[PDB]
Design an enzyme around this catalytic site. Structure first.
Site, PDB file in Angstrom:
ATOM      1  N   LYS A 195      -0.432   3.883   9.330  1.00 55.02           N
ATOM      2  CA  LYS A 195      -1.257   5.046   9.021  1.00 55.02           C
ATOM      3  C   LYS A 195      -1.339   6.008  10.201  1.00 55.02           C
ATOM      4  CE  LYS A 195      -4.080   2.590   5.631  1.00 55.02           C
ATOM      5  NZ  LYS A 195      -3.550   3.495   4.576  1.00 55.02           N
ATOM      6  N   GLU A 222     -12.293   8.097  10.681  1.00 56.55           N
ATOM      7  CA  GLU A 222     -11.948   9.248   9.862  1.00 56.55           C
ATOM      8  C   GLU A 222     -13.203   9.978   9.407  1.00 56.55           C
ATOM      9  OE1 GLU A 222      -8.826  10.060   9.760  1.00 56.55           O
ATOM     10  OE2 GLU A 222      -9.443  11.974   8.883  1.00 56.55           O
ATOM     11  N   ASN A 242     -11.310   0.850  -5.038  1.00 56.28           N
ATOM     12  CA  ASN A 242     -10.276   1.734  -4.497  1.00 56.28           C
ATOM     13  C   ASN A 242      -8.931   1.531  -5.190  1.00 56.28           C
ATOM     14  OD1 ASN A 242     -11.986   2.936  -2.358  1.00 56.28           O
ATOM     15  ND2 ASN A 242     -11.883   0.880  -1.462  1.00 56.28           N
ATOM     16  N   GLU A 245       0.247  11.549  -1.431  1.00 60.03           N
ATOM     17  CA  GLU A 245      -1.097  11.624  -1.985  1.00 60.03           C
ATOM     18  C   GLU A 245      -1.971  12.533  -1.131  1.00 60.03           C
ATOM     19  OE1 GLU A 245      -2.110   7.555  -1.739  1.00 60.03           O
ATOM     20  OE2 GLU A 245      -0.852   6.924  -3.421  1.00 60.03           O
ATOM     21  N   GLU A 267      -1.596   9.370   3.144  1.00 60.85           N
ATOM     22  CA  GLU A 267      -0.630   8.323   2.819  1.00 60.85           C
ATOM     23  C   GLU A 267       0.587   8.845   2.060  1.00 60.85           C
ATOM     24  OE1 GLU A 267      -1.516   5.204  -0.079  1.00 60.85           O
ATOM     25  OE2 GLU A 267      -1.337   3.707   1.516  1.00 60.85           O
ATOM     26  N   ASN A 301       3.666   6.935  -0.311  1.00 62.01           N
ATOM     27  CA  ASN A 301       4.224   5.703  -0.853  1.00 62.01           C
ATOM     28  C   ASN A 301       5.744   5.793  -0.858  1.00 62.01           C
ATOM     29  OD1 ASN A 301       1.408   5.226  -2.932  1.00 62.01           O
ATOM     30  ND2 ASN A 301       2.207   3.702  -1.491  1.00 62.01           N
ATOM     31  N   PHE A 350     -17.186  -3.989 -12.497  1.00 64.33           N
ATOM     32  CA  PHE A 350     -16.195  -3.088 -13.088  1.00 64.33           C
ATOM     33  C   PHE A 350     -14.831  -3.757 -13.230  1.00 64.33           C
ATOM     34  CE2 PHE A 350     -18.844   0.649 -11.506  1.00 64.33           C
ATOM     35  CZ  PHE A 350     -19.407   0.833 -12.752  1.00 64.33           C
TER      36      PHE A 350
HETATM   37  N1  LIG Z   1     -10.687   9.880   4.149  1.00 65.49           N
HETATM   38  C1  LIG Z   1     -11.068   9.512   2.922  1.00 65.49           C
HETATM   39  N2  LIG Z   1     -12.101  10.168   2.346  1.00 65.49           N
HETATM   40  C2  LIG Z   1     -12.489   9.804   1.120  1.00 65.49           C
HETATM   41  N3  LIG Z   1     -11.992   8.847   0.334  1.00 65.49           N
HETATM   42  C3  LIG Z   1     -10.974   8.215   0.929  1.00 65.49           C
HETATM   43  C4  LIG Z   1     -10.459   8.477   2.188  1.00 65.49           C
HETATM   44  N4  LIG Z   1      -9.407   7.620   2.475  1.00 65.49           N
HETATM   45  C5  LIG Z   1      -9.310   6.877   1.400  1.00 65.49           C
HETATM   46  N5  LIG Z   1     -10.225   7.180   0.426  1.00 65.49           N
HETATM   47  C6  LIG Z   1     -10.372   6.541  -0.876  1.00 65.49           C
HETATM   48  O1  LIG Z   1      -9.579   5.364  -0.892  1.00 65.49           O
HETATM   49  C7  LIG Z   1      -8.648   5.412  -1.993  1.00 65.49           C
HETATM   50  C8  LIG Z   1      -7.374   4.703  -1.613  1.00 65.49           C
HETATM   51  O2  LIG Z   1      -6.917   5.202  -0.338  1.00 65.49           O
HETATM   52  P1  LIG Z   1      -5.507   4.792   0.242  1.00 65.49           P
HETATM   53  O3  LIG Z   1      -4.418   5.343  -0.587  1.00 65.49           O
HETATM   54  O4  LIG Z   1      -5.463   5.172   1.722  1.00 65.49           O
HETATM   55  O5  LIG Z   1      -5.546   3.207   0.169  1.00 65.49           O
HETATM   56  P2  LIG Z   1      -4.483   2.023   0.113  1.00 65.49           P
HETATM   57  O6  LIG Z   1      -5.113   0.727  -0.201  1.00 65.49           O
HETATM   58  O7  LIG Z   1      -3.681   2.073   1.412  1.00 65.49           O
HETATM   59  O8  LIG Z   1      -3.522   2.511  -1.052  1.00 65.49           O
HETATM   60  P3  LIG Z   1      -2.234   2.021  -1.856  1.00 65.49           P
HETATM   61  O9  LIG Z   1      -2.511   0.733  -2.553  1.00 65.49           O
HETATM   62  O10 LIG Z   1      -1.911   3.179  -2.805  1.00 65.49           O
HETATM   63  O11 LIG Z   1      -1.133   1.921  -0.794  1.00 65.49           O
HETATM   64  C9  LIG Z   1      -8.503   6.896  -2.304  1.00 65.49           C
HETATM   65  O12 LIG Z   1      -8.093   7.099  -3.651  1.00 65.49           O
HETATM   66  C10 LIG Z   1      -9.921   7.413  -2.054  1.00 65.49           C
HETATM   67  O13 LIG Z   1     -10.766   7.199  -3.178  1.00 65.49           O
HETATM   68 MG   LIG Z   2      -2.664   4.858  -1.827  1.00 68.11          MG
END
Ligand SMILES: Nc1ncnc2c1ncn2[C@@H]1O[C@H](COP(=O)(O)OP(=O)(O)OP(=O)(O)O)[C@@H](O)[C@H]1O
Ligand SMILES: [Mg+2]
Ligand SMILES: *C(=O)CCCC[C@@H]1SC[C@@H]2NC(=O)N[C@@H]21
Lengths: 229, 673, 246
Positions: free
Chosen positions: B122, B206, B241, B281, B294, B296, B354
């Site tokens: 990241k 963040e 999430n 995204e 991010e 993908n 949920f």
């Molecule tokens: N800076 C942020 N501010 C607000 N919400 C956030 C932020 N970062 C992440 N989120 C929330 O977290 C969710 C998932 O974020 P992210 O894609 O970084 O996670 P991940 O587990 O790495 O994803 P993936 O499984 O797609 O690789 C987003 O859809 C959002 O709802």
């Molecule tokens: Mg993601």
């Protein structure tokens, strides 16, 4: 409920490992009309299952082994429970459907002292006496005299079917196992009518119940028989 | 799907589930032989059946079957597969797999290892995006080692603080914080959990964005430098999430913002030298200010919706790009055609957090493939079982239409015609979401499920008209069953005298209220009087089919009768939600008024062993809250092993029958509440 | 010039007297008789008529008909002591045919069960043969009397045939009746028990309620069997027997 309904969910219900068990009530629910089953003595002698259901709208009696409880082995209580139900179904022109997964009788000195011989012979007699139509399906196992009691070899069973995972071994367990790891030794000697896919099971049974509805047999006259009770 | 264009001859799909089925389908359409890898428990799966040939790879656990890279390489060598497709997840993001494949002889259908390594972390992804002159989520660049650094850098970025764990993903190792003490405690516990699970221990701070809108851009690029953006997708309805409902055309966005986001994504892809299909995204605020979040480097789970609105087969384009062919489409060729909505049908209980993973075997499975404008992506067939090793995701349901309203209506119709019996699913939650007023209007955010159901999911709160319709349908079904019970064949010895009852007076108990219903039958039409309200219900009244279509006052409703008892209990799935109704006759209810309520504490607080045997292993760990019907330990006797469930509903305090304990019949097994 | 005449006599002497004196002596030292000796003791002198003397050279069973005090009876006697390896289809076929003949004419069936020598050690048509025997036992139930005398160890599904019969008699210290052997009981139930304790005559005449009477040895058992057979009618179509009274 159409009589030709397929039941693909039964194609993998029987595990490959013989050490692992499954629920026969799931098979019974899948096969019968509208998945409706009236079980008799549900909480007693749970290693065997008896009950009433419908096939194509016609009342049928169901007897089956339960591999979940006591590995499906037969004993005194299950023997008498199945025997009286079979006798009642035969006495009132109700066809019988049997599901066979029995590995034998429960060993031990308690069973022998309790009279396991007489009580097992009760089920032998009950199946051998019935003149109603009777359809037998072997799911996985049928060993020893337990093979004979559960409607096999001409004393019971107008039509006999075996699933591809079924197998009959007189003494279960390299060259010998492969020969008897399949129902082919049974098929070649005419033990079973055919080897059917599970998905067709219900349909097959329905067809048989149409053909055998007019079954009539003749037996020598007697005042009554001598129950091995 | 022109077969004259020569492509690979053999492709091995190194995945399972529905994505493997989709890849096999698109390869079959292209005349390519397919090889499917599988575990022992998946030897009868759907993708194995539709594949040209299959290879067993290992045991049930995913760490030994779908991650045993040596076994996959051996399968590739023994099958001489020219190409390999990783789908999503598993080894699709492993640098070692791609390195070995490119090292020996195998071409890899996916992004190059350089891009995967660049966007894997990241921090590196954020710094590269900042260097790529694209808008980024504002925050402190670098790795934070102590909470005091976190608070000092949180002084200026803003009060909303997010603790995020570098790399990984899956909606884990990420938390929010408001206060400074919250800053320290969240940072410390996040470091602890990252060390426990992630192992990277790299954390970043963040600036949290309130009411964020998660919008993805699907980019496609070849090895010749061309890059295209295939519109966008909206994935905002999320729990844990993790996305459940996705929407291809963004109603929130307009043409200009969409074009700007697509151009930024294309620029980022060119900067990272991406040479496959990927997704970028973004988080969009209320004022339409998108910030990068991010990228993908694989195929997204929700890719079918952008396929529906564009008419492009993404996997086919990925295969062609991997072959070496240039992109056959230009940026002007991309266009929006209609509207598309997708829901993820999971094997989970929506009433608990949920969604909570559930296990079981599917006794009945029927997809609504005959409905208009519906596409189903599932590797599930009747008889399939939901184990604990893999994701408990049953299917993906996609509906397309001329606009949002038609797509939503078709999706509701498809959800009402989807038969799943054997496990607990989340169809009720999906149908409640798609018919919500806010969702229809379009004002949604990532906290949609958080604020629409602050107390959690409760079901469909049915109105007065809907309640009357449900009561009428249940009464009509009860009367139809009673009437069918009287249709015997002719006896010719004792003729049956069919009763000539005209009006059925019934007491229907729903939730906690009791209603009086008067039902009358006129052929195939039932006149139902519910508390003075008159309704007409007409249908074919086929009592065996899983789905029943009825017409109440002209309104068409599809209902499912899940269960029925002679005592009057009946479970009806109506409008996606399962309601329990008790139906009796008036005389039966009057006599039932005299029945004494029996307390249901049951007996045998201590569980009794059904058979004496030793325990090979214990599946669960003491201290876990379980209920009746959940397996605890496996006891073997007479050379057969039974994984019996807990005797009494209660938390597992301590497992008395550990490994090697030859516990007798009718004895204590596990300390339960 | 055909040697069939001497071959027939050789086969007759092999069936009647066995291949050698070895295992007949071995049976004698155990205090038990042979199948043919038991048949000779049970029936009236000079009244036995054997059937199927020549089926796959043996058969470990001797079947036929005879007279007890002038009344017709059908008998079979098992001779598994080093006389047959497996209870083949010929065994069950002979038993089934003799029982079919008895049902056809309306005469009782007496079966001497001594399946001790070789139990099975291999057989798939064996279960089929016992299934046929069970069917014919159930068919004859209430039509003709059926008597079982266990004169040796009987194990497995075989034990179900005597259970279906009307009366069951055992010989003390030399007869056993059990579905499953003591070694399997040790392997599964994990308890120590002997053959006499598990299925001996005392166990089945005092606790299990399977057998009806026990006798000292073979001669006493056969004499008592004749005495008991004097009571019963030949068929259910006949009235109760009436003897002269003083
Ligand atoms: N800076 C942020 N501010 C607000 N919400 C956030 C932020 N970062 C992440 N989120 C929330 O977290 C969710 C998932 O974020 P992210 O894609 O970084 O996670 P991940 O587990 O790495 O994803 P993936 O499984 O797609 O690789 C987003 O859809 C959002 O709802
Ligand atoms: Mg993601
Ligand atoms: C285990 O030690 C092997 C013996 C158990 C055999 C199984 S269980 C009991 C049934 N009786 C029999 O003869 N086979 C079956």
């Amino acid at each position: 409920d159409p009589s030709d309904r397929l039941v693909p969910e039964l194609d993998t219900i029987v595990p490959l490992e013989s050490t692992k068990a499954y629920n026969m009530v799931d098979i019974i629910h899948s096969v019968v009309d509208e998945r409706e089953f009236f079980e008799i003595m549900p909480n007693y002698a749970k290693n065997i299952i008896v009950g009433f259901a419908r096939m194509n709208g016609r009342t049928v009696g169901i007897v089956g082994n339960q591999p979940k409880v006591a590995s499906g082995c037969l004993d005194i209580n299950s023997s008498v429970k199945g025997a009286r139900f079979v006798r009642f179904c035969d006495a009132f022109n109700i066809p019988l459907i049997t599901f066979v997964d029995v590995p034998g009788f429960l060993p031990g000195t308690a069973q022998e002292y309790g009279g396991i011989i007489r009580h097992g012979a009760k089920l032998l007699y009950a199946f051998a006496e019935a003149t109603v139509p009777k359809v037998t399906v072997i799911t996985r196992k049928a060993y020893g005299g337990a093979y004979d009691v559960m409607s096999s070899k001409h004393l019971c069973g107008d039509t006999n079917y075996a699933w591809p995972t079924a197998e009959i071994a007189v003494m279960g367990a390299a060259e010998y196992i492969e020969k008897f790891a399949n129902p082919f030794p049974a098929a070649v000697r005419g033990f079973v009518d055919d080897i059917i896919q599970p998905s067709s099971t219900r349909a097959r049974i329905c067809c048989d119940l149409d053909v055998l509805a007019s079954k009539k047999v003749q037996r020598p006259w007697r005042k009554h028989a001598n129950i091995p009770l | 799907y022109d077969p004259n264009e020569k492509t690979f001859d053999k492709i091995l799909v190194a995945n399972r589930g529905e994505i493997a089925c989709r890849v096999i389908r698109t390869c079959k359409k292209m005349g390519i032989k397919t090889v499917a890898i599988h575990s022992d428990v998946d030897a009868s799966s759907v993708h194995v059946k539709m594949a040209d040939e299959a290879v067993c790879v290992g045991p049930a656990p995913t760490s030994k079957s779908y991650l045993n890279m040596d076994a996959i390489m051996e399968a590739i060598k023994k099958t001489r597969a020219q190409a390999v497709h990783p789908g999503y997840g598993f080894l699709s993001e492993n640098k070692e797999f791609a390195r070995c494949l490119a090292a020996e002889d195998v071409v890899f259908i996916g992004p190059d290892t350089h891009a995967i390594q660049a966007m894997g972390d990241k921090i590196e992804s954020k710094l590269l995006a900042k260097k790529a002159e694209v808008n980024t989520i504002p925050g402190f660049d670098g790795v934070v080692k102590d909470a005091e650094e976190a608070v000092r850098i949180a002084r200026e970025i803003g009060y909303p603080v997010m603790i995020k764990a570098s790399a990984g993903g899956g909606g884990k190792g990420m938390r929010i914080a408001w206060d400074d003490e919250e800053t320290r405690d969240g940072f410390r516990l996040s470091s602890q959990e990252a060390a426990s699970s992630f192992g990277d221990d790299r954390l970043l701070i963040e600036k949290f964005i309130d009411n964020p809108r998660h919008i993805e851009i699907q980019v496609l690029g070849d090895k010749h430098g061309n890059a295209l953006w295939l519109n966008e997708r909206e994935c905002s309805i999320q729990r844990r999430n993790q996305k459940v409902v996705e929407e291809a055309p963004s109603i929130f966005l307009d043409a200009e913002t969409r074009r700007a986001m697509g151009e930024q994504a294309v620029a980022l892809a060119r900067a990272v030298k991406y040479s496959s299909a990927g997704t970028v995204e973004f988080l969009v605020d209320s004022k339409k200010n998108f910030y990068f979040l991010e990228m993908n480097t694989r195929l997204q789970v929700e890719h079918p919706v952008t396929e529906c609105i564009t008419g492009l087969d993404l996997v086919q384009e990925m295969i062609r790009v991997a072959k070496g062919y240039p992109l056959r489409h230009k940026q002007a060729d991309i266009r929006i055609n209609g509207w598309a909505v997708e829901c993820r049908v999971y094997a989970e209980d929506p009433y608990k957090s949920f969604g909570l993973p559930s296990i079981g075997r599917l006794s009945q499975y029927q997809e609504p493939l005959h409905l208009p404008g519906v596409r189903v992506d599932s590797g599930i067939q009747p008889g399939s079982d939901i184990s604990i090793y893999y994701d408990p995701m049953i299917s993906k349901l996609i509906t397309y239409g001329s606009d949002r309203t038609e797509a939503l209506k078709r999706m509701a119709d498809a959800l009402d015609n989807y038969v799943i019996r054997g496990v607990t699913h989340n169809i009720a939650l999906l149908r409640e979401v798609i018919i919500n007023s806010r969702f229809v209007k379009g004002d949604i955010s990532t906290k949609f499920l958080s604020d629409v159901y602050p107390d959690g999911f409760k079901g469909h709160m049915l109105t007065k008209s809907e309640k009357n319709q449900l009561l009428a349908i249940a009464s009509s079904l009860f009367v139809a069953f009673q009437l069918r019970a009287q249709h015997f064949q002719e006896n010719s010895r004792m003729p049956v005298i069919k009763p000539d009852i005209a009006n059925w007076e019934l007491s229907v108990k729903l939730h906690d209220k009791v209603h009086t219903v008067v039902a009358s039958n006129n052929g195939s039409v039932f006149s139902v009087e519910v508390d003075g309200s008159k309704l007409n219900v007409t249908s074919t009244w086929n009592l065996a089919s899983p789905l029943l279509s009825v017409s109440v006052d002209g309104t068409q409703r599809t209902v499912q009768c899940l269960s029925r008892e002679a005592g009057g209990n009946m479970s009806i799935q109506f409008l996606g939600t399962v309601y329990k109704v008790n139906i009796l006759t008036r005389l039966a209810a009057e006599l039932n008024k005299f029945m004494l309520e029996k307390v249901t504490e049951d007996t045998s607080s201590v569980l009794r062993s059904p058979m004496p045997g030793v325990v090979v292993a214990v599946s669960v760990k003491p201290g876990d809250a379980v209920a009746e019907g959940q397996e605890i330990c496996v006891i073997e006797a007479m050379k057969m092993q039974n994984s019996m469930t807990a005797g009494k509903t209660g938390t597992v305090k301590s497992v008395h029958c550990q490994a090697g304990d030859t516990v007798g019949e009718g004895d204590l097994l596990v300390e339960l509440e | 010039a055909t040697s069939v005449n001497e071959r027939i006599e050789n086969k007759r002497r092999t069936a009647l007297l066995g291949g050698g004196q070895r295992r007949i002596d071995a049976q004698h030292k155990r205090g038990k008789l042979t199948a043919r000796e038991r048949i000779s003791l049970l029936l009236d002198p000079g009244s036995f008529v054997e059937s199927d003397m020549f089926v796959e050279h043996g058969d470990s069973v001797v079947t036929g008909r005879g007279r007890i005090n002038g009344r017709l009876v059908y008998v079979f006697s098992q001779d598994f002591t080093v006389f047959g390896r497996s209870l083949s289809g010929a065994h069950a076929q002979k038993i089934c045919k003799i029982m079919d003949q008895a049902i056809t004419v309306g005469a009782p069936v007496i079966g001497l069960n001594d399946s001790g020598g070789a139990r099975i050690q291999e057989g798939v048509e064996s279960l089929a043969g016992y299934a046929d025997i069970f069917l014919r036992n159930v068919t004859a139930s209430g039509v003709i009397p059926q008597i079982s005398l266990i004169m040796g160890p009987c194990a497995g599904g075989a034990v179900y045939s005597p259970a279906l019969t009307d009366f069951t008699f055992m010989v003390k210290d030399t007869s056993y009746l059990f579905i499953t052997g003591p070694d399997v009981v040790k392997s599964v139930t994990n308890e120590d028990v002997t053959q006499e304790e598990l299925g001996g005559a005392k166990t089945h005449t005092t606790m299990s309620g399977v057998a009806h009477r026990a006798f000292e040895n073979d001669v006493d058992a056969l004499c008592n069997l004749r005495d008991f057979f004097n009571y019963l009618p030949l068929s259910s179509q006949d009235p109760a027997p009436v003897r002269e009274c003083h």
